[PDB]
Design an enzyme around this catalytic site. Sequence first.
Site, short mmCIF file in Angstrom:
data_model
loop_
_atom_site.label_atom_id
_atom_site.label_comp_id
_atom_site.label_asym_id
_atom_site.label_seq_id
_atom_site.Cartn_x
_atom_site.Cartn_y
_atom_site.Cartn_z
N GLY A 1 1.25 -4.83 -6.55
CA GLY A 1 2.50 -5.43 -7.02
C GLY A 1 3.61 -4.44 -6.64
O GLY A 1 3.29 -3.28 -6.31
N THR A 2 4.95 -4.91 -6.76
CA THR A 2 6.05 -3.95 -6.44
C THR A 2 6.10 -2.72 -7.03
O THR A 2 5.35 -2.53 -8.10
CB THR A 2 7.39 -4.76 -6.94
OG1 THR A 2 7.54 -5.65 -6.13
CG2 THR A 2 8.54 -3.86 -7.18
#
Lengths: 233, 140
Positions: free
Chosen positions: B30-31
């Site tokens: 994820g980010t």
Amino acid sequence: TQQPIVTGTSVISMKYDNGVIIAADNLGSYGSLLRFNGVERLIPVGDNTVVGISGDISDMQHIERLLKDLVTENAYDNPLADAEEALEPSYIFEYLATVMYQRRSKMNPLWNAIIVAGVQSNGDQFLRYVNLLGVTYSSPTLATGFGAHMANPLLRKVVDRESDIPKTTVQVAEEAIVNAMRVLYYRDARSSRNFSLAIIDKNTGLTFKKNLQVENMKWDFAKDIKGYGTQKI
Amino acid sequence: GTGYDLSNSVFSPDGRNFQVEYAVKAVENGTTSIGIKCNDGVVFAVEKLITSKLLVPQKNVKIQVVDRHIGCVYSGLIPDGRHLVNRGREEAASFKKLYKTPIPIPAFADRLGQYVQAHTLYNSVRPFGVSTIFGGVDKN
């Protein structure tokens, strides 16, 4: 079903051309004992609404906590919490009214009389009442308990119908409310000289005045009154 | 044998819980998001990948507030992160209601901690697919 123990008396209010005014003394009675004197019964919510509560103080404190939560919750995942999506007076009222009726409907009421005063985002004045029975209503002027009997007659002389609102100034209005507070001090045995007053103006915002006192009271004529009928000295 | 990684609360022979480790993969995928502790507060910041010109700028907010003094940001399965904040919000409301004082950061951390650890105790639930950075200013 319960019974009120520590209580707050009248909450008077009215609306003028630019907003609404609401006031309530700072007394917390216990039967006939004037027990507490630092009781604020005007609950400000945000900067466009003020909630005046009378009745059972313990329930009032609960209503207070409910309101602080409504604020906290509305701020969640709400990037417009201080703008387009801020709590409106009408939202705050419908919430409280919902609660009041649910409670009376469960035969366990919040023993209060509440007046929500404020200014909507479109500038409209908001003034509505709700009590332990879940009953609600609006009028150019609104008062609870004793103020209903003594404050409304005086305040209605300033704003008898709707058309009188725009013709009424903050000064005329605040004056009427302050005179009413004095009258109530004269005849309501559960009232205090000290009180708070708040103005919610669509231009000046929310002005919350604390520690006011009834002044200019007439008591001198009392000296001329002796006996209860035939006594002369 | 094998298969120690198919059920959530199962201990593998080397004492690990593979499902949690796989949850981590979802996080690493994820980010990126961070938190910097300053001399009297904390700062949170996160990366918001622009999939297309269609995403209304500034709208899909990620940082979440708990109560009025806590900030939370996470990387991984976003829906899981919201779930964890919803819990934290209740956890905080409950605490304030009983103790009056808004919840201390450490106290809040464990609330989130215990709840997350709980999802590594049974095979009827999946571990959270997010690592969360949160904090605030409290009594001390």
